[PDB]
Structure formats: structure tokens, C-alpha cells
Write a structure and sequence with these properties.
part of a larger assembly; 6 chains; A mainly alpha (30); B mainly alpha (73); C little secondary structure (81); D little secondary structure (138); E little secondary structure (69); F mainly alpha (161); A: 30 residues; mainly alpha; D: 138 residues; 3-stranded antiparallel β-sheet; binds chlorophyll A; binds beta-carotene; binds dodecyl-alpha-D-maltoside; binds iron/sulfur cluster; photosynthesis
Chain lengths: 30, 73, 81, 138, 69, 161
Amino acid sequence: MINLPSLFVPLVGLLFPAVAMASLFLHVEK
Amino acid sequence: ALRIPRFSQGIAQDPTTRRIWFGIATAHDFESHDDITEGRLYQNIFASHFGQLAIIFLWTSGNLFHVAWQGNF
Amino acid sequence: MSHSVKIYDTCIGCTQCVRACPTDVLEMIPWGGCKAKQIASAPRTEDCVGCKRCESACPTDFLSVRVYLWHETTRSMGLAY
Amino acid sequence: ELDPNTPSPIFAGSTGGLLRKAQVEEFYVITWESPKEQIFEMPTGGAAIMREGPNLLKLARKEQCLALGTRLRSKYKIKYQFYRVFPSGEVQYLHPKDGVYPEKVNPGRQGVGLNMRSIGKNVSPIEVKFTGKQPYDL
Amino acid sequence: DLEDIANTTGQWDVYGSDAPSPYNSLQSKFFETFAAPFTKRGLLLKFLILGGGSLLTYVSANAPQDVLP
Amino acid sequence: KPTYQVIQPLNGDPFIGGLETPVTSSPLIAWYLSNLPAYRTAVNPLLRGVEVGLAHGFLLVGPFVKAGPLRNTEYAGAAGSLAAAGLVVILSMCLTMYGIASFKEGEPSIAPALTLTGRKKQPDQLQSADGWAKFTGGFFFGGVSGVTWACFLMYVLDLPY
Ligand code: CLA
Ligand code: CLA
Ligand SMILES: CC1=C(/C=C/C(C)=C\C=CC(/C)=C/C=C/C=C(C)/C=C/C=C(C)/C=C/C2=C(C)CCCC2(C)C)C(C)(C)CCC1
Ligand SMILES: CCCCCCCCCCCCO[C@H]1O[C@H](CO)[C@@H](O[C@H]2O[C@H](CO)[C@@H](O)[C@H](O)[C@H]2O)[C@H](O)[C@H]1O
Ligand code: SF4
Ligand code: SF4
């Protein structure tokens, strides 16, 4: 296929954040 | 005007934002905040910093893991 | 505590001494002998904010109060709004 | 409002007092007497007049509405009077209750002044560890 | 009294809060359920935040021959 | 007729602010804004959803297709969708988890009309969660979609300048 290891910066530095900024808006409510 | 943060109480129904910050910085003050007993406390620092040693090895692991396939050795 | 700052003194006389402080302090509650015989440290404090205007005037001879209340409503800071 | 227009304490405009959080929670309002048509100072920055009715201005929050005194008793009058309005009724009868003028004697009500032990040598720090059986909830 | 003009038509007046336009174009239920799944909203959003956001980022980062940083 | 309405600070009592000047309550404006969720809730939030989704939709194009990160695109997937069919998505649940500051759980259906409304105490809330859904659901199909007759529209353009 050739040259393709780019997912562990969005799933982390991008999407993991989405989760918790969403999710953890559990501090406000759930 | 609801009830939230699960340990303190004065903090818990404070309608401002202090609600937040002051939540995220009383966490580690076990000795005397609602949830506590000299029995609780101790242990509540014990399986805390067993949550320690714990995070020191997910550090060291990766230290040795961005090294072994690239990062000259 | 939830509003607990001690301004007490020993005279608790309040003439050319101290009055200032939004609502909080409906005292003159004469204890059975203390000179100008009006005493203690407060009335029902669940009403107003956190001054130390509380001393500034008329002795507390020790400390004087300030913020210490933590558990802190809003009505207990101007801003709940 | 207007179809019912019941006013007393003249003003015109102002971006000062009352806004959203005096419906959705509590209300607070001061009332008074007065002799003849006089121009006042105001909380919230502005300034207007008097004459009568109830002389019943409504006020945002109760530190705000006693300052009619911290000047509005350097301008004659025994009588000034603020209560507590809800969005429905009572308990907290604010300048109501018994006697008035913070510095007399009928009853004693609350206050106390002491804690357990008095101002004396609390070089004694915090004692027991907080534990559900020894009189430290006061 | 000519300029007493009896307010050249009173109006009524105050129009209203009453009634100075009909309403919203009849275009509606021309979406009835059309696009539902936020019109089946009955438990969702967790679905569209793995799905939508694994396909604004799965292929969105990857690429078959760079055109690099 | 008067000096400026029957001359008033607010609807009435001058102890609320608002200082009703123009830019506030001139029939010149206050009517340019009430087929929509200004004074009165027309139909439910359902439909307003997409005129809101869509209008705000075909925006955010030349913003991120003419000011794009390496700009003036020669990629057939820009001068339109490209990514930004991301903003509407990063914010089409920036909303949903604000309608969790709305719950209040019902199903009446009163977008049909009865007796000349008021919705009365219509201020404060009085729009439950099963409302704020059908809007931020109108949002997605208004955002994503409103991004393509932007894109889809060729581009003949001027300026300028
Ligand atoms: C010019 C720059 C500058 C810099 C370099 C910093 C740097 C810092 N500030 Mg800071 N700050 C600044 C200006 C700056 N500040 C200014 C001007 C103000 C106000 C005048 C502040 C007020 C401020 C406060 C109150 C604090 C800091 C803190 C900090 C530190 C926390 C770092 C961190 O990683 O948190 C990371 C931040 C976040 C994770 C929050 C951002 C959330 C965003 C991305 C969400 C976007 C919402 C989105 C639309 C929703 C999509 C939905 C999705 C989530 C599902 C860091 C030292 C904090 C501190 O002391 O910590 C030790 C904190 O106390 N700052
Ligand atoms: C982005 C905004 C910012 C914000 C949050 C505010 C907020 C406010 N302004 Mg304000 N203002 C701003 C920028 C802003 N202003 C600027 C840049 C100016 C020029 C100096 C003003 C001049 C101004 C005045 C004179 C007044 C206010 C007032 C107010 C307050 C109430 C008025 C109101 O909401 O009527 C509702 C507003 C509308 C219905 C706006 C409709 C106009 C739209 C349709 C324009 C569409 C543009 C069109 C396509 C072409 C124009 C292209 C381009 C040149 C813009 C409110 C606190 C009033 C006040 O002090 O409080 C009572 C007061 O009257 N403002
Ligand atoms: C109206 C409208 C809209 C919407 C809006 C909205 C709805 C928004 C929202 C927004 C949101 C909704 C946001 C959020 C954010 C978040 C955050 C900001 C979070 C976070 C965080 C963090 C960072 C955390 C921290 C912490 C905590 C708190 C816990 C403990 C400690 C710690 C540190 C962990 C728009 C504009 C679209 C347009 C249309 C109209
Ligand atoms: C995709 C198929 C759409 C065709 C409609 C059939 C199912 C609609 C999904 C809701 C499930 C309950 O089925 C329902 O459908 C009808 C709408 O057509 C309903 O009719 C109504 O139901 C709601 C109940 O508060 C109301 O807000 C609306 O007036 C209307 O949608 C009947 O109450 C019932 O039969
Ligand atoms: S010390 Fe202060 S308020 Fe206390 S008793 Fe005297 S004046 Fe009264
Ligand atoms: S010192 Fe305290 S109690 Fe006294 S007035 Fe000030 S705030 Fe109120």
C-alpha cells in the first residue's frame, strides 16, 4: 500500500479530546 | 441550582464557575473534605499513589518504545 | 461558617464603636452583665456577603473576620447573575 | 408594565438594576416615606425624585437596597423598609419581623459568639479528625 | 381645526403585537422524517461521534502518496 | 405619534435596563426578526433548524476556500466542502450537549395553532429537550448540505476590487 501510519495524533490530540470535552461536560451535567 | 461534585458540599452547589476550578484542586486534599476518616484518608492516599508507581511505568515504557524501530541505536 | 469570622471583643457596646455592614448584624442582645450590656458576635448570618467592614471599627481584640466562610452561596457574592 | 401601572419611585431609563436573575430566583425590594418632592442619588448610577404612593422601588439584591440609608439617612426620615419578594410569596420576612433599628432589645434570636471554647489560647489547633459522634457541627 | 387632523387614520393603532405577516413558507413535511436519524434522535449522538468523526479523520488523515507536510 | 413612542424605558418600568432606544425596538428592525425565534416560537424548533443550518451553511466557504490554509485551491474538493463540512459537525453537537442543559421531557405537538398564543410565560425556558433535538437535527441537515450549493455552485465571481 505504501506510507500510512497517521491516526494516533487525531484519535489522541484531536478525537480523544472530543470525547472528554464532550463526555466530561458531565461536570456541568450527564 | 442542582447538586454535583462528589466529595465536597459547600463547593457542590455553588452557582458560579468556582464550582469548577475549585473542584479541580481540592481533589487531592483528602484530610478533611466530606468523604474522610483517618481510616479513609490514609488508605485514600495509599491506593492513590499505587495509582502511583503506576503512571511512572507508562512513562518509562514509552521512553523505551520511541526507540527500537527508529531513533538510531 | 458558613459565616464564621470572629469579631467578638468584650464590651460589645455599640456607641461610637460599630454599625457598618449590609444587613448581617442585628445584635444588641444584652447578656446578663457586660458593661454597656449588649454582647455576643452576630445574629442570623445567612443573609449577606463577606466584609471585615465588620471590625475595621469597634474591637475584636484578637482577629477581625474577612472572607472565611467557603461554603458560599451567591446571594453571598453579588454575583449570582 | 402598564395596563396595571402602580408606580411610586420616579426614574426614567437605565442599564443598572434588575435583570434575568430576579425572576428565575429571588427578588428583593425597598419601600419608604418622605416629605416634599425631593431629588435623590440612587443605587445603579442614575438619579430621580419622590412625593409618594407606597414609595416602593424594587431592587436586584438587598445590599443594594439599604444603601438608601448609608446616604438615605443623611436626608431625614424614620421609616425605610425593604422586604423579600419571591416568584411566589414568603418565608424570609426581611425587614418585617420584630422591632427595628439593629441596636435595641426585644429578643436575641441567633448569633451566640463562642463556638465551643472562646477566643482564649486556640494555639490548640484543629482537634478530632471530623467523625460522626462528637459535637462539631456548629 | 384642520391641523386637528383626527390622526389621519388612527391605525387601530397598534397594528398589533398583532399581525404583520402570516408565517413560514409551506416547505416543511417536505422534510417530515426526511433526514430522520436526528429525527429519530431517541437515544443517539454517541454513534455520530464515533461514525462521523472517524470519517472526518480516518481517511481525512492517511493519503496514498503524501503531497506531504 | 409622540416624541418617540409614548416615551418609555423598556416595555414599561425603568428598573430593568434594556433602555429601549432604537437598535432595540424600532418597528424598523423588530419585524426583520420574528418569523424566526425572536418574539414567538413559530412552528416548533423543528424546521427553523435548516433555514438556520443552511443560511449559516453556505457561509464558511471563501472563509475556508479563499482564506484556506494554503489558499486559492486547484483541488476539485475545495471552493466548497473540502473539510468545513467539519465546522457544522464540530458544532452540530457543540449544540446537542447544550440541549442537556435542557431536559424537561414531553410530547404535545403544538406547532399547529389553537387560541392566539402568547406561549405566555414564553420567556425563561418552556422549550424542553424534545424540541432542542429537532432543531439541532435541522442544524446538521442545514450545515452539512448548506455546504454544497456553496460548493456545487460553480463560481462566477467577481471581484474586484
Ligand atoms: C498568550 C497566551 C497564553 C499562554 C501561552 C497561556 C498558557 C497557559 N494558560 Mg493561560 N490565559 C491567557 C493567555 C495564555 N495562557 C489569557 C489571555 C487568559 C485570560 C486573560 C488566560 C487564562 C488562563 C486560566 C484561567 C488558566 C490558564 C492556564 C494556562 C496554562 C494551562 C495549559 C493547558 O494546556 O490547558 C489546556 C486547555 C484546555 C484543555 C481548554 C480548551 C478547551 C477548548 C479547546 C474547547 C473548544 C470548545 C469547542 C468549540 C467544542 C467542541 C466540542 C467537543 C469538545 C466535543 C498554560 C500555562 C490554566 C492554568 O493555570 O493551568 C495550570 C488556567 O488556570 N490560562
Ligand atoms: C457584534 C456585536 C456587538 C454586540 C454584542 C453588541 C451588543 C449590543 N449593542 Mg451594539 N454595536 C456594535 C457591536 C455590538 N453590539 C457596533 C459595531 C456598533 C457600531 C458603533 C454598535 C452600535 C450600537 C448602538 C447605537 C446601540 C447598541 C446597542 C447594543 C445592545 C442592544 C441592541 C440590540 O441588540 O438590538 C438588536 C440588533 C439588531 C436587530 C441588529 C440588526 C442589524 C443587522 C440585520 C445588520 C445586517 C447587515 C446588512 C446585511 C448589511 C450591512 C453590512 C456591514 C456594513 C455591517 C447590545 C448589548 C444598544 C445599547 O446600547 O443597548 C440597549 C444601542 O442602541 N449598539
Ligand atoms: C447557540 C448557537 C450555537 C451553539 C452554541 C453552543 C451550544 C455552544 C456550546 C459550546 C459548548 C457546549 C462548549 C463546551 C466546551 C467544553 C469545555 C470547555 C470542556 C472542558 C474541559 C476541560 C478542559 C475539563 C477540565 C477539567 C475538569 C472540568 C474536570 C476536572 C479537572 C479537569 C482539568 C479535568 C452556534 C454558535 C453553533 C450557532 C447557532 C446558535
Ligand atoms: C417514517 C414513518 C413516518 C410515518 C409516521 C408513522 C410513525 C411516526 C413516528 C412516531 C411513532 C409513533 O407513531 C405515530 O405516528 C403518527 C405520525 O404520522 C403519530 O401522530 C403524531 O404523533 C406525535 C405524538 O405526540 C405528535 O407530536 C404528532 O402530531 C404526530 O407525529 C401517531 O401519534 C402515531 O401513529
Ligand atoms: S467589639 Fe464590635 S461590635 Fe463587638 S461588641 Fe464591640 S463593637 Fe460590638
Ligand atoms: S463583616 Fe461580615 S457579616 Fe459583617 S457585615 Fe461584613 S459581611 Fe456582613
